[PDB]
Amino acid sequence: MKLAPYILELLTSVNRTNGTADLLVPLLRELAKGRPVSRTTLAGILDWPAERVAAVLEQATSTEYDKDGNIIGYGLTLRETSYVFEIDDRRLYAWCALSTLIFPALIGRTARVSSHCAATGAPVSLTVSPSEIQAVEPAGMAVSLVLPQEAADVRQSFCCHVHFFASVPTAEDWASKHQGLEGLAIVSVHEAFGLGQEFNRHLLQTMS
Ligand SMILES: [Br-]
Ligand SMILES: [Hg+2]
């Protein structure tokens, strides 16, 4: 299907203020270590004043902090979700199915992704590298997409509707009882991965 509207509105949704892209990649790479990330650590990696780091994050209202005020969630998260995202020996989580397909390229590492079909509960799993997916089980795994809304919190307007499914027929059946959800579409996990690659290329082309 035509994916330009999805790529466009997702880019808009994340690139609200400049610096977001520049801060995103290091933050994701730090979070992938499996520990909360401090604003000073980001400041040092970025060589920014910590005043700028918090400024960028304040715009990302979805951002999760822990009891110490450190960052534990931004696309990847240490707080449990339906999407398990493992790098090396660390178990992390992701906010949505598309996130699991996008972040391995941004962090430069291969992830073991697992979840459950949103319509049937069947376990699903696959290995996501920066360039390809492997061990897609079951092999006909699908993904739901919706059109991101620009001003809305991305996690509540997009992430919460973007799931894995056992198969495309299963997802479509599920989709038929989810009307009035703008842009709702079912794609193969392969097509969703390609969407993620297009998104990443556009996002990275906007860094310093
Ligand atoms: Br289009
Ligand atoms: Hg997402």
Curated annotation (Swiss-Prot):
The keyword NADP does not apply. It catalyses: an alkylmercury + H(+) = an alkane + Hg(2+). Gene3D superfamilies: 3.30.450.410. Keywords: Lyase, Mercuric resistance, Mercury, Plasmid. It comes from the Bacteria. Cleaves the carbon-mercury bond of organomercurials such as phenylmercuric acetate. One product is Hg(2+), which is subsequently detoxified by the mercuric reductase. Belongs to the MerB family. This is Alkylmercury lyase. It comes from Escherichia coli.
